[PDB]
Amino acid sequence: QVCDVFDIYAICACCKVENEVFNNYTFRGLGNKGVLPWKCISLDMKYFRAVTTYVNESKYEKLKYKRCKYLQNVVVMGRTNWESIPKKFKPLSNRINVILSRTLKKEDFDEDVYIINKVEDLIVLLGKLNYYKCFILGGSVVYQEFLEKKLIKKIYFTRINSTYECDVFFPEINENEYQIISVSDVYTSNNTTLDFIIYKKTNDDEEEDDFVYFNFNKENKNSIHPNDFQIYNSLKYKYHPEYQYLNIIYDIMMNGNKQSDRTGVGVLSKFGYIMKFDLSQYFPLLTTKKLFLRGIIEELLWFIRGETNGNTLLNKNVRIWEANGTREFLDNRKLFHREVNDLGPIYGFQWRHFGAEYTNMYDNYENKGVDQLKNIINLIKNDPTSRRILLCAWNVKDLDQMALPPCHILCQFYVFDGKLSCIMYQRSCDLGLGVPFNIASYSIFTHMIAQVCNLQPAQFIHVLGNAHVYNNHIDSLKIQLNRIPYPFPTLKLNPDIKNIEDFTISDFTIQNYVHHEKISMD
Amino acid sequence: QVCDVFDIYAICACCKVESNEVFNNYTFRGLGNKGVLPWKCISLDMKYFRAVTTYVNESKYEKLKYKRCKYLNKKLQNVVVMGRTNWESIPKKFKPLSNRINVILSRTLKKEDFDEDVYIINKVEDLIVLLGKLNYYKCFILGGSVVYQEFLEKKLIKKIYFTRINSTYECDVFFPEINENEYQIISVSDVYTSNNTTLDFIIYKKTNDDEEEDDFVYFNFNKEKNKNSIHPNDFQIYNSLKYKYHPEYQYLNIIYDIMMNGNKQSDRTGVGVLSKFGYIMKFDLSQYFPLLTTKKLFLRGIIEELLWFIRGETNGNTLLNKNVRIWEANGTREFLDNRKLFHREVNDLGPIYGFQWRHFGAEYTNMYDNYENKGVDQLKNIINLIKNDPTSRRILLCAWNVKDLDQMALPPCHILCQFYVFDGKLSCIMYQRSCDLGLGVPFNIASYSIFTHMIAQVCNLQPAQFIHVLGNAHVYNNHIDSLKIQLNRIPYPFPTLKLNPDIKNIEDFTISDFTIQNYVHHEKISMD
Ligand SMILES: NC(=O)C1=CN([C@@H]2O[C@H](COP(=O)(O)OP(=O)(O)OC[C@H]3O[C@@H](n4cnc5c(N)ncnc54)[C@H](OP(=O)(O)O)[C@@H]3O)[C@@H](O)[C@H]2O)C=CC1
Ligand SMILES: NC(=O)C1=CN([C@@H]2O[C@H](COP(=O)(O)OP(=O)(O)OC[C@H]3O[C@@H](n4cnc5c(N)ncnc54)[C@H](OP(=O)(O)O)[C@@H]3O)[C@@H](O)[C@H]2O)C=CC1
Ligand SMILES: CC1(C)N=C(N)N=C(N)N1OCC(=O)Nc1ccc(Cl)cc1
Ligand SMILES: CC1(C)N=C(N)N=C(N)N1OCC(=O)Nc1ccc(Cl)cc1
């Protein structure tokens, strides 16, 4: 077939167009009033250059022998495509430029800028040329025809995670025809998140042996099948940051230790992982299922206030600590003399009054115990190279008084070149229900500390101690692993807020959260 | 020449031989004794030996057929060549060597004196002819000391696959001293335990759908002007190695990442460091004790410090009486005064590790006070949780008592230990807030690895993984030259730690209950 012999790849960038279900079709905005929908997106413009111009001559011979039996790249445009290009660069910095047109003759441009009559008249032009691969730069109509006639092999698709006004749309790529094989890292250019994905059409080596020898000792470990992680195992490059979470699910399903827990439900457990997310490039809110952030933002505002009063949350219908405050739960904790929803000296108490004697959840504790939250802020502002900027919730003295010991042991902060990174160490991590919320919680927190100290958020680093998947979560997570992440959304904080205690629920916006549908983890 | 065409490799296994000791690669030279191997079974070596000497790649032969047939002007099995003593050492049940073309060098013996499917040769010359007239993938020289000596001398070996057996045995025959101009190490394996010895595997080398490979180059359009440009020529040895699988490279490779990508910051004193934030190292304590080999470390001091912790001591005088100076500088009049501890006795370090481990929440008075049944005895508690509720996810030991920070001589570097129990095996995560890669971390790895052993033993479990999480990971700028020397040293196989096994209680350990066996190490380095 033609499209494997000649190497015809499309290359596009699609934004979003003016509740809401998402799928790949979400991204389709191509152009508007003859120009791109967006002002300038220089990373995608840079990606464009690299992909179209790149050449590898050492693999061209293998192309030259197959192509005949039947150096630079070919780039195909349409008139309104060729036209919209600002003058001062045509032809495009050393590429074989080419235009599919009806009312243009090859006379009135160069002899390098080969015009074509119809789609069928391109195969003619290639068998007579010396080129690496063939990139359809496109236009609505150009893409429509080249796809309709199964001419395109791979598709270099840039997903622009922001909404614009559009007069022209990429066609609905048929998912039984084509399928995503690679997803890139997520990036911020020009005040939007984006990523780079790849649709394919469906069907010394001294040191290579030395590799095999070194593997001479390697070991259905857990009852988890091959055919079920199909989409997951059928991707080549999985560089989207959400794969950091998803790959831990995989490792614990594949290699996890079978264990009883207190409940009896059954878990697969491993011990010791890192996740790093770049807060300067995205907000890591998992896209492979719907997540809600009001509750966990109220939880955070509750901590910052120093509250241990489970009821302040329940009245706002944030039920994160409902189970941990019942008579039945406090009694099983031997807390027989503790009022319902009095969670004892937990996070907020420890952050604001570590070392103070806890009484009940209504006492006045002003200027009692160590106000760690205040202390790490001053340190961040006044001593940013300090290696002592920890917020610790694990107060050994008070553990038995807490409804439960803190799942999140401590935050450590780091400062370089007006940028703030944070490590949260989590002693116990429910990967299915908990961890996705936990990533979002401390990322927001990392932003909040960043803002009130006049620093840019850099890295949120999540250290997992006991990392467990509930046996009764495995079906749901199987469905989830075989979803492909979307580009992440962004967090906008109200910039007026300049002290850690002044954030209200209103001051938090999530933008461009493009997500798969909800999953009952149960 | 002749070695590249016919792919003639050597494979051996060498132990240390009977002899303030200095160590080079000639440390590992002992090949056999009284006609046989110096050791009973080392199964992991024997299995490696089989994987390498029987592995062929069908698809790769075609190009080797071509290459070899070109030079001569013209199931798949490897050839294995052995001296007659070597051949006679093999038991009948394993002769001839399975799934391989056996060749034997000998003058005293001819075909007539062998029942077995074997080629006999009296000349090295005859082998090269034999190889010319045969279909094989790779030719491995199994040795005998004499066979090894002459195939080297004749510049015939492309690579030596070399097992360092990190134990000592009576030996009568030795591997030849390898000329370091002739052969350079290009690979070093993981370290392992088999039949009560550590070993690794190192490869000496001689000197003098391709559509989705393009997709990689694309997904790198946005990479590096690499921060601190320190010079290549400096890390020549470190970067030459193709496979760096020795667990010590976990430490070494962080030094490199900090040197090449570290952030420049001036610190608490007005000195100068390179820093990054957030690393993890994993060390399999069932397989080796990860005491670093690229420089000398003594453990007496850090074992005294750990016994001093477990006792709940805060008294610097106890360590100085044992000539352990680890805490001396944090105990001086000058230092306690600069921490505003004007009302604190010299060497009274206040409510630090020991105090927090046995008495967390008790009011610190002075280092002489009897704090019995005051504060939470964390150490006793976690020893009980590991014994009675092993799946508990709350087996943390914590030194970071927020309330007492200002009363300590300095806050703890080593913040907490979380423990994990599966199938009678104990693992330990240790979170370090501030890590001097240069002096501190080598010791910090040694301390918590010994601690995992101690807890594991007194709870009737086996040590599994010690996991080291680094927060602010930094290199002092005056350590840089010293660390360059160090990154160009090739690790040796790790030693082993023996705990006196009669100790059933965490408090009952004493210095003499601790034995490091087979520490093979490079030379002492002053980071200063
Ligand atoms: N999102 C993206 O990745 C990209 C978007 N763009 C945007 O695309 C928009 C323009 O695209 P759309 O309107 O289709 O314009 P096109 O670029 O597809 O141009 C259409 C013209 O190409 C010629 N043509 C198409 N098919 C044939 C054929 N089968 N036989 C002969 N000639 C043919 C005709 O030229 P004639 O005029 O001679 O009839 C036709 O009018 C602009 O807004 C531009 O900014 C451009 C590139 C990439
Ligand atoms: N640790 C390890 O990795 C290894 C250890 N070993 C050990 O080493 C010892 C055996 O080795 P070592 O005694 O050197 O003896 P070798 O195995 O090298 O035997 C040498 C004999 O083989 C013959 N031979 C060697 N070279 C030639 C030649 N060029 N032309 C004709 N014949 C030749 C001669 O046999 P003849 O006497 O018949 O003339 C010679 O006496 C044993 O203890 C064995 O277990 C062996 C291999 C590996
Ligand atoms: C520009 C765009 C949308 N981005 C990607 N990744 N891939 C494409 N095919 N698109 O470009 C085609 C095109 O017309 N490019 C182009 C080249 C130079 C200028 Cl100045 C403007 C548009
Ligand atoms: C087996 C041994 C000692 N290990 C390595 N790495 N390399 C070798 N050359 N050695 O073996 C050579 C030999 O004589 N092998 C042999 C094979 C089977 C038995 Cl049963 C005994 C010895």
CB A199 within 8 A of CB A182: no
Partnered with residue B187 across adjacent β-strands are B203, B243
In chain A, the N- to C-terminal Cα span, in Å, equals 47
What gap in Å lies between CA B521 and CA B528, rounded to an integer? Answer: 19
Give the CA count within 13 Å in the CB-facing half-sphere of B289: 29
B3: left (phi over 0), alpha (psi -120 to 50) or beta: alpha
What gap in Å lies between CA A448 and CA A471, rounded to an integer? Answer: 36
Ligand 4 pocket, residue B142 CB under 6 Å: yes
Judge whether A333 is closer than 8 Å to chain B, CB to CB.
no
Q: Do A207 and B267 touch (CB under 8 A)?
A: no
For a mutational test of ligand 4's pocket, the pick from B11, B94, B164, B200, i.e. the residue with the most ligand atoms closer than 8 A to its C-beta, is: B11
Q: Do A390 and B396 touch (CB under 8 A)?
A: no
Please, which residues 468-497 of chain A have a Cβ atom closer than 8 Å to chain B?
468
If you write DSSP's letter for every residue of B282-340 in order, what string do you get?
A: EEETTT-----SSS----HHHHHHHHHHHHT--BHHHHHHTT--TTTGGGSHHHHHHTT
Residues 6+ apart with CB under 8 A from B523: B22, B295, B296
What gap in Å lies between CA B52 and CA B11, rounded to an integer? Answer: 9
What one-letter code names the amino acid at A166?
C
What gap in Å lies between CA B30 and CA B14, rounded to an integer? Answer: 5
CB B417 within 8 A of CB B430: yes
Residues 6+ apart with CB under 8 A from B276: B257, B258, B261, B262, B263, B473
Which residue among B213, B378, B394 places its CB closest to the CB of A405?
A: B394
Judge whether B376 is closer than 8 Å to chain A, CB to CB.
yes
Give the Å distances, CA to CA, from B123 to B79, B128, B181: 16, 9, 27
Q: Tokens for A137?
A: 């730069």
Partnered with residue A428 across adjacent β-strands are A466
Alpha carbon B236 to its chain's center: 21
What gap in Å lies between CA B44 and CA B52, rounded to an integer? Answer: 12
What gap in Å lies between CA A47 and CA A158, rounded to an integer? Answer: 9
For a mutational test of ligand 1's pocket, the pick from A79, A90, A143, i.e. the residue with the most ligand atoms closer than 8 A to its C-beta, is: A79
Ligand 4 pocket, residue B90 CB under 6 Å: yes
Quick one: A2-201 is in which CATH superfamily? Answer: Dihydrofolate Reductase, subunit A (3.40.430.10)
Residues 6+ apart with CB under 8 A from B151: B8, B10, B124, B141, B157
Q: Tokens for B57?
A: 């790649």
CB A446 within 8 A of CB A283: no
Q: Tokens for B317?
A: 């005088």
What gap in Å lies between CA B245 and CA A218, rounded to an integer? Answer: 14
Q: Tokens for A517?
A: 């549908």
What gap in Å lies between CA A230 and CA A240, rounded to an integer? Answer: 18
Range list of H helices, A386-509: 434-452, 474-481
Q: Tokens for B273?
A: 């460091």
Residues 6+ apart with CB under 8 A from A266: A258, A259, A260, A470, A471, A472
Q: What approach was used to elucidate this structure?
A: X-ray
Cα torsion angle, B91, B94, B95, B97, sign: negative
Q: Write the DSSP symbol of residue A518.
A: P
- Name the nearest CA neighbour of B248 among B289, B198, B290: B290
- For tokens 């890591």, name the residue: A284
CB B314 within 8 A of CB B345: no
Judge whether B46 is closer than 8 Å to chain A, CB to CB.
no
> Which residues sit directly before a break in chain A (C to N > 2.5 Å)?
18, 70, 203, 219
Diameter of chain A measured on Cα atoms:
94
Catalytic residue among A407, A411, A429, A453: A407
- Residue B436's SS3 state is strand
- Name the nearest CA neighbour of A344 among A263, A301, A387, A406: A406
**What b/e readout covers B1-25, taking b as 16+ CB neighbours within 10 angstroms?**
eebebbbbbbbbbbbbbeeeeebeb
CB A16 within 8 A of CB A27: yes
| φ, ψ dihedrals at A44, nearest 5° | -70, -40
User: Residue A353: which H helix or E strand, with range?
Assistant: helix A347-353
Q: Could you count the other beta carbons within 10 Å of the beta carbon of residue B328? A: 13
Q: Indicate the CATH number of B8-206 among 3.40.640.10, 3.40.50.300, 3.40.430.10, 3.40.1800.10.
A: 3.40.430.10
What gap in Å lies between CA A370 and CA B457, rounded to an integer? Answer: 38
* Rounded (10°) angle between helices B440-458 and B300-311: 50
Radius of gyration of chain B (CA): 28
Q: Could you count the other beta carbons within 10 Å of the beta carbon of residue B90? A: 15
Q: Could you count the other beta carbons within 10 Å of the beta carbon of residue B243? A: 19
Residues 6+ apart with CB under 8 A from A170: A12, A14, A28, A30, A138, A140, A143
